């Protein structure tokens, strides 16, 4: 008989999704990592050269983190003694070595503790954050010219990200932007004086005898945010005798009325820069399109050239409003706005016009815009088969918009149904990347007429190995309530039988856009629970769920913790009424978002659940960060929603969970959903006589995410789920 | 049949023992509460009188949590607004009835946040500590005298305690001490100004947005220590002097060499203070008898009247060196010290002669000396029947050794083997306290003639009520292991069969000086365990346990987790011996000290036990107080005993757990023994991959004492104590 996908393999990574992650360095050529090796690839024929040999670096007397190579190829950057900080930000040491002349560049090195390096887009020109500060190298060897001065740890942030910012606005430390040919450098600085600090306590090796207070400036719901400001500094006029000047750019007047947050900055040209502005409350953004004025030396953002975007529903944007894509002159461009039946399309807008253009509509969405040529646009959207769970590459004729033609959807549709992509420089080539249903799949592809020139990747010796593994299978479904389809995916364990009745875990996210049935092949937690334990473990996306319209997406607007908890409810109800679930058996657990439904869920009263687990769970609104709870449930003021974030909160449930079986897990060293949130509803469950399970993980994150803390939490959630379902 | 002694009978208190707690108020009578009305009681007779009516204070508009009456009857002192800090330190509201007017006093009220207040020993006057500075009030309705201008939170303490001293030293937050007339105000003054603050989150209501860090000066062992100075002050020239002179008394030479500790102040007469000083090595005290001196109103410590107590084995005292009781004319004391043989007894020094005599003697200890007069001293010992676990209460003619009585051994000696004593002012009364083995039994007696006058209160209706109840036994023996005698006690289930095998679970504390083999009558968990679940409750005395000489007490010293970690798996060996026991059903709980010992033997691979709970433990000496670890570990130095400090970790056990089945237990607001304590455990089994069961309890102390925390923490180890042993 052959082997189950175990705990063990999922643990220790037995079964190895391989991987094709190429680096664009032209229109015709990509680097890519083998054998530790560097090689430079022809996307025409597939031909290779070695780039950087491996035993380069081999006396480097550190171990290298990453390696950045400049886009001329003269240089790299060589990072090393890599620090963590939040999900983006870290500080390392660099040094640089010239490619040409084959040699380490010992002098004016960039310092240690350095927080943010980038190259030049074009050339090798270096910007780089060091206490809070920027500073600018013309040439690797020369000596930086500092550009800001007001940096101070915790307070001014100058080209990097705050706490608040990095994690819910940008997604990144760095807060630099090269204009396109590298004349300009624009950033923004953060001014975090009056944000509360969240206080905790890191205990480190035992060898620490006091335990120590990480304290970080991170705004909760309704708090003082951070400020922010913009500025333009030329590059190519820089002094060694002289301090280098900075052009501010202002907010416009609709957003200095009161608080708001940069949340887009794009260049458009070399001389045209655009901004994207949020109010505080997030359901009203503006776009500025600001040029660069020769003779006075400043940035002007005309009046005629700004364009707003605003809800009525909800929110502007899936998270934030979306990026622009300008064409080659900068006077037009393409961007993913809501339509007016409230479904995502692109829309072609004049930067002096208000009026858009959609160039794509009906009852599906565009995830991205991809690349932008002459005579086509480029872009994903989950149209196909009306598959929301779906991702396709598609592109439209510019000069005719009834011709869209599908580049990704016949491939291998038996295979294939969620792709990304990445394109060449000027878009000659692209490379598609299938990650589901089956093995993922890395193609090249020519766009001149989308030949498919090579298989890059198909995961073959995975295949052989898993031929050998009783694999669970996975079922895309859906179900209908209140005249509207609601998808769902059921992980099923192997040989199933559709006569016999299994325990059924539902495995919850349920934030707004959130998106947990679909088409990507994954080799995870629920994998072992159906292969070796025979656990059906299930996902839903109702009411409040992304990818399709804002009739969905909207409908917890000012209203979380109260739909998408009803509707994992109800379909779970669905499921328990079908002839393979065990009613006496169903189970939910999930993570941050997932954490508060399952823990709404377990403590809704309603019967349907025997267990759940909550890990790292918001429980209270006003625990929550201001960027991301601000965007679903405005400011907890009486003149606003206050009434409601008091209503959905986890503590006011906790005699319901009297019924229930409940494990509470939570890292000490959470940055992100703190350590409070989880501390509190402990303290209610106490309160009414509940008991329950529990586990800290001393100085872990919201990741839980050091080997060790990562196998032993695990390892705890089966044991859990096992003595639940009755499982020796 | 009748009912057990179920777990909601110990968490819901149904079974209730009655006290019967006076207050002494002259040598003659004492105050009584019945049905909120204070009664005074003449002792001769037993009639009573209503000394304050339960509607006095219906009208105050506080609750009145405790009241403190005046020497001189005048006044009474109403505490409100209490506010708990540490074991023995709080704030309160505080106001004076005058009892003679029947009148609330509204003027120069004692202020808000107070945190202490004394009455002066004869008399009504007041000394009271507020912002950690002394004041004197002469009268209750007159203005204050401030006697120090240095107070400063967490830096500066007058009359009162640090952390450190509350809680290890004077087992109080009183610093200040009155002469016995009131004319002299002694008082001690602590800096913490270089003492390192550990630091912890406290959540409180779910309403707090963001958690609060508590900071408090704690010294772990080894750190920088709070430094003393003592002072006197003459009360009665107050009125007369702007500013009165608070005198100095200086620490002697032998002590001023290093760090050192004020351990004791005792006033032997109106014009001669007594003090004890303690060196930081705690082996090494020095006693100063110091005498006004009226001619230059300094107070001078005369080299002849110094007495020193060493230890050659340990440390000096059970937990400091005893307090002396001095004879009226103050020229000679009474004092308990360890005596050529390692057994405490009582000493009697003349105040100007080195070498003192014993007054008692034997293979037995004296506890305490309860009173003095000019014929008899009167003192609590363990001598009866060779029982270091019994109490009784004894008599020595000061004109005559030889004659000695039992006052207490007799008085029922089936129901009463642990007695604690009352004397009245003068010691004319005395009330007669015992604990058991069997129900707490309260009698009054006159001392001329050691007569009962009458039963106080005898528990007949808990009698009553006991009588329905199928109640656990107590067996108290001992084993004998390299031919000493160790001390051990069982709590047996009822109809008790040795020919049936029991599960047992092993019940510890194990510290320094500890004792947990007694004839003490309680009501508790272990009463549940052995009436309910049939488990046998059993506690050892193994070496390092108290009141049975120095031998056994120092045998730990300097090497705490070696001999009474190995002295716990070595009764539990024994126990399995006896043939009562199932071997396969072995389990150990313990907290504070009991947490660290459990942990060690759960770490040790010993094999014996299947299960153990740690609740608060100690994991590290370095993590824990300078007072307490250093007084047995001494110096965390590579020149004194840092090698066993690092040796003696319960991290560096964690690959053994593995065997076990542990439960790891912590209030996160406990301010004595870190939640760092449990975070380093539970981090160091996971870093091992270690499966076990942890509780964190939000904002509880050291007590886990809360009523809802309390039921919580009993209702979750008795589910996994009943787990371990297979009990439905
Ligand atoms: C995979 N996954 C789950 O299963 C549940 N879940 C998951 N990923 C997620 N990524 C996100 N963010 C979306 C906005 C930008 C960035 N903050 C990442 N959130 C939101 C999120 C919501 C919350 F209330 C508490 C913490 C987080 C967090 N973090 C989740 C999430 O809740
Ligand atoms: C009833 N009981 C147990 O069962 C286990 N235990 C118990 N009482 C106790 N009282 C004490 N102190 C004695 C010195 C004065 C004062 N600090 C109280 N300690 C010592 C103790 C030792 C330790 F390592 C960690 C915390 C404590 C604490 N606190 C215990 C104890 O350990
Ligand atoms: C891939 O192959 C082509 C040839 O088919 C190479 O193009 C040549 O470039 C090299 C040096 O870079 C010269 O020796 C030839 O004269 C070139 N021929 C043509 C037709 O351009 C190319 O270098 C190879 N690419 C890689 C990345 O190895
Ligand atoms: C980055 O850190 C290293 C180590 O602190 C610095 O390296 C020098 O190396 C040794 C120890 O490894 C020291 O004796 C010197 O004081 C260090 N300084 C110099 C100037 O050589 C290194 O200088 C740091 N790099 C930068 C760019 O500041
Ligand atoms: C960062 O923002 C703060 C405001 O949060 C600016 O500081 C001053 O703020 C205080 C209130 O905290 C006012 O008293 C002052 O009028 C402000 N300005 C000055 C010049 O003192 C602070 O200047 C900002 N720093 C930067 C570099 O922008
Ligand atoms: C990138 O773009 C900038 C801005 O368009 C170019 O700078 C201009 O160059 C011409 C010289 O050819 C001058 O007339 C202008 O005064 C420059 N403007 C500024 C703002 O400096 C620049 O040449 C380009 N750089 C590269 C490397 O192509
Ligand atoms: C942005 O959202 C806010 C909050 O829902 C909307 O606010 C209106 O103004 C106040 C809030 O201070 C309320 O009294 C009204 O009920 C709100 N109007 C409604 C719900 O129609 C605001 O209208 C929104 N902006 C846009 C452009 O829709
Ligand atoms: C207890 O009883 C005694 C004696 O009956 C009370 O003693 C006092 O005796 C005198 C006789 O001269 C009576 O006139 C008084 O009633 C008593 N004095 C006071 C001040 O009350 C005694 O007081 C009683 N004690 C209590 C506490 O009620
Ligand atoms: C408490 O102790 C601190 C030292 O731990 C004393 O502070 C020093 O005071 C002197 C003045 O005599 C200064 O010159 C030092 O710089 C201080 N040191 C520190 C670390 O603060 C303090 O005076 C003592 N306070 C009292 C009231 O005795
Ligand atoms: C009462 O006397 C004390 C002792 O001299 C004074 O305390 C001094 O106060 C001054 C500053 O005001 C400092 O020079 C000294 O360091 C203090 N010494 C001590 C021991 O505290 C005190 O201020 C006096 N109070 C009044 C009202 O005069
Ligand atoms: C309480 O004791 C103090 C100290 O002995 C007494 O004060 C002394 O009184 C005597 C008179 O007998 C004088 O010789 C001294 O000058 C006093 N000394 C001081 C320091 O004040 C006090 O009188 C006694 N008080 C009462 C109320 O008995
Ligand atoms: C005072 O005691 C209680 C209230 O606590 C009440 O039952 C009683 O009537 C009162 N007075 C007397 C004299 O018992
Ligand atoms: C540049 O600005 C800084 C910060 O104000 C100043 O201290 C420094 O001296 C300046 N250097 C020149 C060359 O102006
Ligand atoms: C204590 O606080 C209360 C409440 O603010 C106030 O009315 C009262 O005057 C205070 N008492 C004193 C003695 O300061
Ligand atoms: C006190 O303890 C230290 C450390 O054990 C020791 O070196 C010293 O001699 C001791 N004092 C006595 C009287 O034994
Ligand atoms: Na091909």
């Not at 502005?277 to 003779?295: G, T």
Request: with cysteine.
């Amino acid at each position: 008989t052959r082997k189950t996908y175990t705990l063990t393999d999922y643990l220790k990574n037995t079964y190895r999704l391989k991987l094709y992650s190429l680096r664009w360095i032209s229109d015709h050529e990509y680097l890519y990592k083998q054998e530790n090796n560097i090689l430079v690839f022809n996307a025409e024929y597939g031909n290779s050269s070695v780039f950087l040999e491996n035993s380069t670096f081999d006396e480097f007397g550190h171990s290298i983190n990453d390696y950045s190579i400049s886009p001329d190829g003269q240089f790299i950057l060589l990072e090393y003694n890599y620090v963590k900080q939040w999900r983006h930000s870290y500080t390392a040491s660099y040094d640089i070595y010239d490619l040409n002349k084959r040699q380490l560049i010992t002098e004016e090195r960039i310092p240690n503790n350095t927080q943010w390096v980038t190259w030049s887009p074009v050339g090798h020109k270096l910007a780089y954050v060091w206490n809070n500060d920027i500073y600018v190298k013309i040439e690797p060897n020369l000596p930086s010219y500092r550009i800001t001065w007001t940096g101070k740890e915790d307070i001014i942030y100058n080209g990097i990200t705050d706490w608040v910012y990095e994690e819910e606005v940008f997604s990144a430390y760095s807060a630099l932007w090269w204009s396109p040919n590298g004349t300009f450098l624009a950033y923004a600085q953060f001014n975090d004086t009056e944000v509360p600090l969240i206080e905790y306590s890191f205990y480190s090796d035992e060898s620490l005898q006091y335990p120590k207070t990480v304290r970080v400036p991170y705004p909760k719901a309704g708090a003082v945010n951070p400020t922010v400001k913009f500025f333009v500094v030329n590059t190519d006029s820089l002094s060694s005798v002289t301090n280098a000047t900075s052009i501010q750019i202002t907010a416009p007047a609709s957003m200095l009325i009161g608080d708001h947050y940069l949340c887009d900055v794009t260049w458009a040209t070399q001389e045209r820069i655009s901004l994207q502005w949020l109010r505080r409350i997030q359901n009203y953004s503006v776009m500025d399109i600001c040029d660069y004025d020769e003779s006075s030396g400043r940035w002007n953002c005309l009046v005629a050239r700004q364009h707003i975007e605003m809800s009525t529903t909800g929110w502007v944007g899936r998270f934030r409003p979306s990026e622009p894509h300008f064409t080659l002159d900068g006077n037009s461009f393409y961007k993913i706005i809501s339509n007016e039946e409230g479904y995502r399309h692109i829309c072609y807008f004049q930067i002096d016009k208000k009026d858009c253009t959609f160039i794509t509509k009906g009852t599906w969405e565009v995830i991205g815009i991809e690349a932008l040529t002459s005579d086509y646009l480029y872009y994903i959207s989950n149209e196909y088969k009306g598959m929301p769970g779906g991702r396709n590459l598609y592109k439209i004729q510019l000069s005719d918009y009834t011709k869209v033609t599908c580049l990704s959807c016949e491939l291998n549709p038996e295979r294939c149904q969620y792709y990304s992509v990445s394109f060449s420089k000027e878009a000659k080539y692209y490379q598609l990347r299938c990650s589901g249903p089956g093995l993922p799949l890395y193609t090249l592809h020519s766009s001149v007429n989308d030949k498919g020139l090579r298989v890059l990747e198909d995961n073959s010796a995975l295949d052989k190995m898993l031929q050998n593994v009783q694999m669970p299978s996975k079922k895309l479904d859906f179900i209908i309530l209140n005249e509207t389809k609601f998808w769902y995916q059921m992980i099923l364990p192997p040989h199933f039988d559709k006569s016999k009745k299994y325990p059924l875990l539902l495995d919850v996210y349920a934030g707004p856009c959130s998106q947990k049935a679909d088409t990507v092949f994954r080799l995870n937690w629920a994998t072992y629970l159906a292969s070796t334990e025979n656990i059906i473990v299930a996902s839903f996306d109702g009411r409040g769920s992304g990818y399709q319209g804002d009739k969905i997406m909207h409908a917890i607007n000012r209203r979380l913790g109260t739909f998408e908890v009803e509707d994992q409810i109800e379909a779970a109800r669905q499921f328990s009424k079908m002839g393979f679930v065990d009613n006496k058996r169903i189970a939910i657990w999930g993570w941050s978002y997932g954490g508060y439904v399952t823990s709404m869920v377990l403590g809704s009263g309603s019967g349907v659940f025997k267990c759940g687990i909550a890990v790292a769970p918001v429980s209270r609104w006003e625990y929550y960060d201001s960027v991301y709870t601000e965007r679903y449930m405005g400011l907890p003021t009486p003149e606003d929603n206050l009434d409601h974030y008091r209503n959905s909160t986890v503590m006011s449930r906790a005699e319901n969970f009297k019924q229930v079986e409940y494990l509470l897990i939570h890292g000490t060293a959470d940055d992100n959903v703190h350590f409070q949130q989880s501390a509190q509803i402990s303290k209610a469950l106490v309160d009414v006589g509940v008991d329950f399970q529990a586990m800290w993980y001393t100085d872990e994150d919201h990741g839980i995410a050091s080997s060790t803390a990562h196998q032993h939490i695990y390892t705890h959630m089966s044991h859990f789920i096992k003595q639940c379902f009755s499982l020796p």
